[PDB]
Ligand SMILES: CC(=O)N[C@H]1[C@H]([C@H](O)[C@H](O)CO)O[C@@](O)(C(=O)O)C[C@@H]1O
């Protein structure tokens with residue numbers, strides 16, 4: 001229709017960009033300055049997940065609203081098939097700091113074979129990364145100095161990237177397959193930040209010691225974006241979707257969050273903790289032993305009063321939505337199944353939108369609208385209060401009033417952003433692991 005905008009796709013990442021053969025897992029975010037940041041996995045040896053790859057994190061920026069993009073940079077690169085996989089972007093509006101978080105595995109490890117726990121040990125009230133030698137002896141890293149089990153200083157030190165130094169000379173990296181001292185083979189959550197609008201980034205912080213429990217095997221970023229709460233008692237809290245497995249391998253979603261501008265982090269409960277299933281059975285993420293109630297990758301949005309909604313990948317075939325009254329610390333016992341939105345067991349994107357649509361607060365949603373990874377569809381969901389919970393809190397559901405096919409054929413992971421002009425940017429997997437496509441759409445298009 002006249003005035004509708006749906007730009008022709010641009011291959012924002014593609015084979016050969018930054019000398020990477022493959023790409024997957026988009027994240028897209030507009031900074032407070034108006035810059036678009038796109039992050040992605042630069043998968044160097046094909047499309048496969050860790051551990052069958054060597055994956056780096058790449059970033060591109062656009063200062064002109066997505067019309068032109070920079071030459072990119074690699075911001076995290078570990079050696080020897082140690083991978084960083086699944087990025088997420090968020091910003092602290094009060095400081096201007098941009099955060100990127102990602103899951104990190106040492107060489108040989110990934111989702112399926114992650115070891116139990118954080119990889120840290122408490123010594124006299126501080127958490128220290130453990131290292132292991134060839135015989136299984138345990139060491140700790142204390143302010144980047146390696147101590148043996150008897151609390152004697154060794155000749156080894158580390159840095160934030162895991163390089164291993166013997167008397168100040170680099171000999172290996174604790175994430176490699178060859179180092180004489182290795183980190184535990186499990187997932188770690190890495191955090192980097194930028195104070196210059198994404199131009200430069202810090203070296204990673206390993207926040208596992210704060211967010212990963214002793215009974216979790218995998219704990220990973222749920223890729224896409226986070227939020228900063230705008231309304232209510234938890235205003236300012238930075239919320240980052242995650243998911244984990246228990247000792248039985250079963251997956252549950254959650255959020256990690258920070259009340260101090262990213263300095264310290266906490267993991268909240270899962271919606272699977274004290275979840276009431278359809279006919280009244282109560283489960284818990286620690287004990288979940290069945291595949292059917294699993295909740296995996298997820299993205300979060302905020303309701304007008306500050307209530308959180310966690311949109312989750314799951315095994316029901318349809319969207320699942322959890323509700324939190326307390327800023328992501330806990331969730332209501334009922335997980336909604338929204339049978340108006342197919343969910344083929346794939347990542348999804350959902351964002352708040354800044355302007356009302358048809359008199360209602362609205363969200364924008366993207367996923368493959370099928371029983372397979374196809375029929376990529378962007379939706380406008382109008383928020384309606386439908387009653388109240390027993391505790392008096394408002395109960396909100398979505399009216400998926402506008403639903404637009406944007407990508408016939410293959411469509412897998414995606415990430416949305418609102419643009420400075422009120423339009424919508426979208427970065428999506430329109431191929432399995434090669435070209436990653438960026439488009440801009442306006443609401444005239446989406447509503448047509
Ligand atoms: C850390 C990791 O493996 N992340 C990968 C996840 C997990 O394997 C599943 O969510 C486990 O259930 O799934 C993908 O394979 C997928 O479905 O396309 C891509 C993503 O990079």
Ligand SMILES: [Ca+2]
Pocket residue numbers: 054055056077078079080081082
């Ligand atoms: Ca690498």
Ligand SMILES: [Ca+2]
Pocket residue numbers: 269270271272273274275330331332333
């Ligand atoms: Ca609960």
